[PDB]
DNA sequence: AGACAAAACGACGCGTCGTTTTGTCTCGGCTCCCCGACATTCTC
């Protein structure tokens, strides 16, 4: 008779909640609560998740983590190189004296930046390899290029020299460190492809296009021939860009079965595709027939202006670096006796692996070659195991008691699909699911071909041999043909047919020199496990060779046949091995079945079923189905459901229905919710906040008691993922335990559709009140644009309706530009009963009389629907104009982080590797500390610097956007002179001057713009800016990096007062917030430097009240009588900078018109947010605003007596 | 080179003639204009008024004279309560001493002088307690 | 009366809140787990 209704509307980042107490039968009822919860994120995310572009902050954190991890692994490699080389006595005294080797193993001493090559004596720097430098300059003068070159070019000369000559040890250490710097591309799997693997980058010329006689789309397709004599595989339409074109391709050659090259083609562009540049550098290095270091040295010899790093060689296969470093080390080995002294080798071994005697024993057999390449430099870790993330069976469990005395359950991991045993399960399931039909009359022709167990067994022996089965094989097995019979499945679809066993049978047939009886079931399982488990190449052939040794099969073609196996497809079945093991014996029939393979419990249940006695674990439906199971012989060939029930006693997944009793269950459910359990973070956040809001309304309006919500209505308005999950979750509150309400969802949950909501809004006048609420924004726009095009008069309503000009009507929506529409939708959903949704979803009646009862009950006479009560519209107006919007906040600055790291610990007289938790305190910053771009400080005499600001200069490309003002913002004066000379030479047009062709022309003829004076080419210049940039850090060279605050990191805005009364404003950066929160203090200082006491601090999504000019709000409080005037003066912070704070009225979501620099108009000026109110007084918001605090439901929170009592009652 | 502070102990041993040596130590601890916390002055007033039963007028004269000419009062810091609570998790002193240390630290003091505070000890790697009478 | 108090004063620099305008790290390979949606078949 009286019903509590909760209407929920779910958006991308909005939850509209409304609770009403309806009595529809008497046309009575009243609203209780209304609100809209908003999760703030930029509209960039809104426009991105529809298409999808890395829309997750977790992914960005993962990317930074991976970059850092690579960095510290490179550092670790370097450290170990320092340790080993210091042991070998290879580092020079000047360098080695300032690496720590005792406490910080291999690290540099703090506040020192050593270079291996520049010895510093009395403040002067000197090069140490004078003689090799002399030899390199001798080489250049023999080549006749110059006699004056950089000293640090000696490394490539040494790398060439190291191949076939004796170099001193320090050069060799430098070379090893260089190799550690540049490691090269490498795929962990390997898996060498087709032996030819042509993949050859070639540049070809087209001779002629003979017209091929292939007429498509009314245009006749041409063919392509090349001068060196192949044909392009694909045809061509456009003739202009193919005739005598110097086109470059990557082609792949495969020797087909006929004995010819099946050549492919693919158009690629050099200097634009990574693969093309990689292959070109590969071929160009190989054709030189020399190591990459010597190749680089030769290219530097022939073109001394060549850019090596990033231009000449960017990325090459790791094989080149490996082979070059090898050749270097073997060649240097014969001359340096330290590379033969096994004492030193053992010393390095022990130093590097003190606590791992096993690894020491392994490496005591190797030498310095393997230790340097295979151990330190080129060591690539394997992928972490994902086995721990494998799913679990829903049936097999294990129970055990921990140290706490409790009893908890370990899961059993699901079966890999390629396992032969799941193969048996699956294809037996197919055997039972198999049935045949005739093509002529479509009758159930089976029970004539498969009626006895022998037919099943023979079909089994034929399928067991094959690898895939299809229409043809299935028909011809029975001697049937295509023309008369079919098999109830897709006529042209194939089904799996024990892939693993067939494939292994074929490969084992190819090896020969063995009898045709070696392959049995256990052998099949063991070899499958060998293939599935060891997925690493060298390990793979070692396991294969050992298997061929133990099993008396010749390892001659065994390993050759058994090397080329496609790795198993990564997929796992629904169930585990033990469960399927228990299942299969029951559905076995014939000779493969025997009673002894049924376990104890299923045998007992079989005896119980045949006996017909009464068991609590056997239901009546079982006997209903198992009436035919009279004898123990009847337990042959049972289907999946029968065998599953007999094994475990459940008729599939019957669910648990469940029913929550109080807010305790709910809050526990939220406490136990796991991250990343849904499609994407957006819907997960939406669902979690919906749950939280439901709990809050339950507590506030019903005190968490049973069945306080009589019914709940849900609506969404991609997003469909929420329509069913939230309904299933919320069924647990409104479900009835009487047995009437059963299913996936409670019958009380009534999802609707947009048709009902829009029709109710139009009929009941919610649209009219919505326009009346939103219109003043439109009059403000009209006044600001001094026009009348934003309001349109009408005479059917005799009033002004909001509107927009067509050229500002791109995607304007009058609902979308606010926040409370969510709550309005929630309200209009809640009052909609099941009868309304049934009527408006099944309006097709087939007879007017049958649905005429609903017509008369719900609609006025079929014109308009009856209101839920007489004062529905007025009450809805009163609520809608009295809703404050609650905005979720993320002020996470620091949080605690746990660090577990592997380490060898001494326990019970033995060292064991175990994880240790980090000692001391260590915080994790939860915001990006600054922006990526890094600038350096400069001091220019020819510019005036205001106090409190500095000049920072950054390198930028010289391009077409460089006009006189920007050219004057280039820090180099001579570059400015030359550049303005050039720009004058091109009639003052940077676009013509600074095109790549123009830049090239400037570079070639630099004399005729530098007054005839010589100068190096220019491509990038350091432009300087004047502003406030802070140091990134205080260690090493970090004190020279100047960065800018990151986006959305100005989170606190302090408002202070002096004893006289004036307000002072400040914005504290994230650095001081971090430091203060680390020292346990408040985020914002409570007094400024002037001693002014702090009113309070503001953060984005805060709420403030802006009092009228006449009101004197000093000890107002009494925030219970919030009326329309009071609530309309509520502003939400949006951003801050310096002493400026920008605000938007809390009911505004989107502006009527944004700001464009052309028209120079907008709803809230250029920033789309104001430092003042929108109303006519236009008062500084920050000078009179008072901060307020709301809860999830938008209810104000203020100090009261009871609160004051409880502050220290909780301590009492 | 280092902002040195003091506590009520230095003033109290300075005041008394019963131990000449400690009195001396204390007075040459005051010659260098050592900084001082307002809570130190409050406790000094409490002990003069309670233990010694001295008149209000003369102890107030002495306080004013010392603050004008002898010791440099340090402005009471507004974050003293939160910082003292922060030091409270890692340290176990009398809470009055913890407020003294908190206000000394928040004012950038490098060296503190006292007796009943476990000399030589480091407080949040910012300030160390030193017993000067030894 | 003479010598203090303070207003001019000619200087530049500064700074002016109000507002708009400008700037903002990038691409490459590959493996392996989980879930979702829509297709077909069988059973409860
Ligand atoms: Mg004390």
Coordinates of C-alpha atoms in Angstrom, one line a residue, chain A residues 875-1100:
Chain A
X875 CA 7.3 19.5 -5.4
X876 CA 9.6 18.6 -8.2
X877 CA 10.3 22.2 -8.9
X878 CA 11.0 22.9 -5.2
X879 CA 13.5 20.0 -5.0
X880 CA 15.2 20.6 -8.3
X881 CA 15.9 24.2 -7.4
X882 CA 17.2 23.0 -4.0
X883 CA 19.8 20.4 -5.0
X884 CA 23.5 20.9 -4.2
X885 CA 25.9 18.7 -6.3
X886 CA 28.5 16.6 -4.5
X887 CA 31.9 16.3 -6.3
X888 CA 34.3 13.4 -5.5
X889 CA 37.8 14.7 -4.7
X890 CA 41.3 13.1 -5.2
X891 CA 43.7 15.0 -2.9
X892 CA 46.0 12.0 -2.6
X893 CA 49.5 13.5 -2.3
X894 CA 51.5 10.9 -0.4
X895 CA 50.7 7.3 0.7
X896 CA 52.5 4.4 2.2
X897 CA 54.2 1.8 -0.1
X898 CA 55.5 -1.7 0.8
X899 CA 58.7 -2.9 -0.8
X900 CA 59.5 -6.6 -0.9
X901 CA 62.8 -7.7 -2.3
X902 CA 64.6 -11.0 -2.7
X903 CA 67.6 -11.4 -0.5
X904 CA 69.8 -14.2 1.0
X905 CA 69.0 -14.5 4.8
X906 CA 70.9 -16.6 7.4
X907 CA 68.5 -19.0 9.1
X908 CA 69.3 -22.2 11.0
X909 CA 72.9 -21.9 9.9
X910 CA 72.0 -21.9 6.2
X911 CA 71.5 -19.1 3.7
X912 CA 68.2 -19.1 1.9
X913 CA 66.7 -16.7 -0.7
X914 CA 63.6 -15.1 0.7
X915 CA 61.7 -11.8 0.4
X916 CA 62.4 -9.1 2.9
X917 CA 60.3 -6.0 3.6
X918 CA 62.1 -2.6 3.4
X919 CA 63.2 -1.0 6.7
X920 CA 62.5 2.6 7.6
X921 CA 59.9 4.9 6.1
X922 CA 59.3 5.5 2.4
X923 CA 56.4 7.4 0.9
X924 CA 54.9 7.2 -2.5
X925 CA 53.8 10.4 -4.3
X926 CA 50.4 9.9 -5.9
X927 CA 50.6 12.9 -8.3
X928 CA 52.9 13.7 -11.2
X929 CA 55.4 16.0 -9.6
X930 CA 56.0 18.2 -12.6
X931 CA 56.0 18.5 -16.4
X932 CA 58.2 16.4 -18.7
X933 CA 60.0 19.2 -20.5
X934 CA 63.2 20.3 -18.8
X935 CA 64.8 23.7 -19.3
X936 CA 68.1 25.2 -18.3
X937 CA 68.8 28.6 -16.6
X938 CA 70.5 31.3 -18.6
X939 CA 71.6 34.9 -17.8
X940 CA 71.3 37.4 -20.6
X941 CA 72.7 41.0 -20.1
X942 CA 70.5 42.4 -22.9
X943 CA 67.2 41.5 -21.1
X944 CA 65.8 42.9 -17.9
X945 CA 64.7 40.3 -15.3
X946 CA 62.0 41.2 -12.8
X947 CA 62.7 40.1 -9.2
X948 CA 61.3 36.7 -8.3
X949 CA 61.6 35.4 -11.9
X950 CA 64.3 33.7 -13.9
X951 CA 65.2 33.0 -17.5
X952 CA 65.1 29.3 -18.7
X953 CA 66.2 28.3 -22.2
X954 CA 65.3 25.1 -24.1
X955 CA 66.3 23.7 -27.5
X956 CA 63.6 23.7 -30.2
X957 CA 63.6 23.0 -33.9
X958 CA 64.0 25.9 -36.2
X959 CA 60.9 25.7 -38.3
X960 CA 58.2 27.8 -40.2
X961 CA 56.7 29.3 -37.0
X962 CA 59.8 31.5 -36.4
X963 CA 58.9 35.1 -37.0
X964 CA 60.6 38.3 -35.9
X965 CA 59.3 38.2 -32.3
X966 CA 60.2 34.6 -31.9
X967 CA 63.5 35.1 -33.6
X968 CA 64.2 37.7 -31.0
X969 CA 63.4 35.1 -28.4
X970 CA 66.4 33.0 -29.5
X971 CA 69.2 33.1 -26.9
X972 CA 72.1 33.3 -29.4
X973 CA 72.7 36.8 -30.7
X974 CA 74.8 35.7 -33.7
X975 CA 72.2 33.2 -34.7
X976 CA 69.7 36.0 -34.4
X977 CA 71.8 38.2 -36.7
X978 CA 72.2 35.4 -39.4
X979 CA 68.6 34.4 -39.1
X980 CA 67.1 37.9 -39.5
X981 CA 69.5 38.4 -42.4
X982 CA 68.1 35.3 -44.0
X983 CA 64.5 36.3 -43.2
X984 CA 65.1 39.7 -44.8
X985 CA 66.6 37.9 -47.8
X986 CA 63.3 36.0 -48.3
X987 CA 61.1 39.1 -48.1
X988 CA 60.3 38.5 -44.5
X989 CA 58.4 35.2 -45.0
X990 CA 59.4 32.5 -42.5
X991 CA 57.3 29.9 -44.3
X992 CA 59.4 30.2 -47.4
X993 CA 62.6 30.8 -45.4
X994 CA 62.2 28.1 -42.8
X995 CA 60.9 25.2 -44.9
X996 CA 63.2 22.2 -44.9
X997 CA 64.4 23.3 -48.3
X998 CA 64.9 26.8 -47.0
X999 CA 66.8 25.5 -44.0
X1000 CA 69.0 23.5 -46.3
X1001 CA 69.6 26.5 -48.5
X1002 CA 70.6 28.5 -45.4
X1003 CA 72.9 25.7 -44.2
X1004 CA 74.7 25.4 -47.6
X1005 CA 75.2 29.2 -48.0
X1006 CA 75.8 30.3 -44.4
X1007 CA 78.5 32.8 -45.6
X1008 CA 76.1 35.1 -47.5
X1009 CA 74.1 35.8 -44.3
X1010 CA 77.0 35.8 -41.7
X1011 CA 78.7 38.8 -43.4
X1012 CA 80.9 36.2 -45.2
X1013 CA 82.1 34.7 -41.9
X1014 CA 82.2 30.9 -41.4
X1015 CA 79.7 29.3 -39.1
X1016 CA 78.4 25.8 -38.3
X1017 CA 75.0 24.7 -39.6
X1018 CA 71.8 25.4 -37.6
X1019 CA 68.8 23.1 -37.1
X1020 CA 67.9 23.6 -33.4
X1021 CA 68.2 26.8 -31.3
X1022 CA 67.8 27.5 -27.6
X1023 CA 64.8 29.8 -27.1
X1024 CA 64.6 31.5 -23.7
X1025 CA 61.5 32.3 -21.6
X1026 CA 61.1 34.5 -18.5
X1027 CA 59.1 33.0 -15.7
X1028 CA 59.0 30.8 -12.6
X1029 CA 60.6 27.4 -13.0
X1030 CA 61.8 25.4 -10.0
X1031 CA 64.7 22.9 -9.6
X1032 CA 63.8 19.3 -10.0
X1033 CA 66.2 18.2 -7.2
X1034 CA 69.3 18.9 -5.2
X1035 CA 71.7 16.0 -6.0
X1036 CA 74.3 15.9 -8.7
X1037 CA 73.1 17.6 -11.8
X1038 CA 69.5 17.6 -10.8
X1039 CA 70.1 21.1 -9.4
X1040 CA 70.4 22.3 -13.0
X1041 CA 67.1 21.0 -14.3
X1042 CA 64.2 23.5 -14.2
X1043 CA 60.6 22.2 -14.6
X1044 CA 57.0 23.5 -14.5
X1045 CA 54.2 22.3 -12.3
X1046 CA 52.2 19.4 -13.9
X1047 CA 48.6 19.6 -15.0
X1048 CA 46.1 19.4 -12.2
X1049 CA 48.7 19.6 -9.4
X1050 CA 47.9 23.0 -7.9
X1051 CA 45.6 21.5 -5.3
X1052 CA 45.6 23.9 -2.4
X1053 CA 44.7 27.6 -2.3
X1054 CA 45.2 29.3 1.1
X1055 CA 43.0 32.1 2.3
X1056 CA 44.4 34.1 5.3
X1057 CA 43.2 37.0 7.3
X1058 CA 45.2 39.7 9.1
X1059 CA 44.1 41.2 12.4
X1060 CA 42.6 44.2 10.6
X1061 CA 40.4 42.1 8.3
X1062 CA 41.8 42.0 4.8
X1063 CA 42.0 38.6 3.1
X1064 CA 45.3 37.4 1.6
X1065 CA 45.6 34.6 -0.9
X1066 CA 48.3 32.2 -1.8
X1067 CA 48.8 29.0 -3.9
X1068 CA 51.2 26.4 -2.3
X1069 CA 52.9 24.1 -4.9
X1070 CA 52.9 20.3 -4.6
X1071 CA 56.5 20.3 -3.2
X1072 CA 55.6 22.0 0.0
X1073 CA 52.5 20.0 0.3
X1074 CA 54.6 16.8 0.0
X1075 CA 57.1 18.0 2.6
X1076 CA 54.5 19.2 5.1
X1077 CA 52.4 16.0 4.8
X1078 CA 55.6 14.0 5.3
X1079 CA 56.3 15.8 8.5
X1080 CA 52.9 15.0 9.8
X1081 CA 51.7 18.6 9.5
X1082 CA 48.7 20.1 7.7
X1083 CA 48.9 20.5 4.0
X1084 CA 48.6 24.3 4.1
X1085 CA 50.5 26.5 6.6
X1086 CA 48.1 27.9 9.2
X1087 CA 49.8 31.3 9.1
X1088 CA 51.5 33.2 6.2
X1089 CA 54.8 35.1 6.5
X1090 CA 52.9 38.3 7.6
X1091 CA 51.4 36.4 10.5
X1092 CA 47.9 36.5 9.1
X1093 CA 45.7 33.7 10.4
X1094 CA 44.4 31.2 7.9
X1095 CA 40.7 31.1 7.1
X1096 CA 41.0 27.9 5.2
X1097 CA 42.3 26.2 2.0
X1098 CA 40.5 25.5 -1.2
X1099 CA 40.9 22.5 -3.5
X1100 CA 39.3 21.7 -6.9

